[PDB]
Every structure is written in structure tokens, then in C-alpha cells.
């Protein structure tokens, strides 16, 4: 049921969590935010780090 990401879709595939603990979305599909692999260090979503 829950939706995520900037695309407002259900979970699928590999997803990353915003490192802003105040993020209102938290989880993002890799493809939606241009990722190919897990970031090894910090990662902030396009809404938190515009």
C-alpha cells in the first residue's frame, strides 16, 4: 500500500534512503534519482538537497 519517492509509486527494485532524518519521503527508487549503486557515504534526496 505505501508509496514512496518523488514518483509516488510503491516500492520496487533497489531503493535508497535520504540521510536527512527529517525527510518527509525518506525512500527513493535508484532509477528515479539517477543512482546505479548504493552510495557509500552520505546521500540526500532532490527535495532535501535541491
Amino acid at each position: 500500500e505505501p508509496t514512496y519517492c518523488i514518483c509516488n509509486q510503491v516500492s520496487f527494485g533497489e531503493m535508497v534512503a535520504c540521510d536527512n532524518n527529517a525527510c518527509k519521503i525518506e525512500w527513493f527508487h535508484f532509477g528515479c534519482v539517477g543512482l546505479k549503486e548504493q552510495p557509500k557515504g552520505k546521500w540526500y534526496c532532490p527535495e532535501c538537497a535541491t
Binding site: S11, F12, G13, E14, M15, V16, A17, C18, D19, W27, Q38, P39, K40, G41, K42, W43
Partner: peptide
């Protein structure tokens, strides 16, 4: 960064 695989 944290990730998950669904």
C-alpha cells in the same frame, strides 16, 4: 547511505 532491495 542506507539501501534496500525489494
Amino acid at each position: 547511505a542506507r539501501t534496500k532491495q525489494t
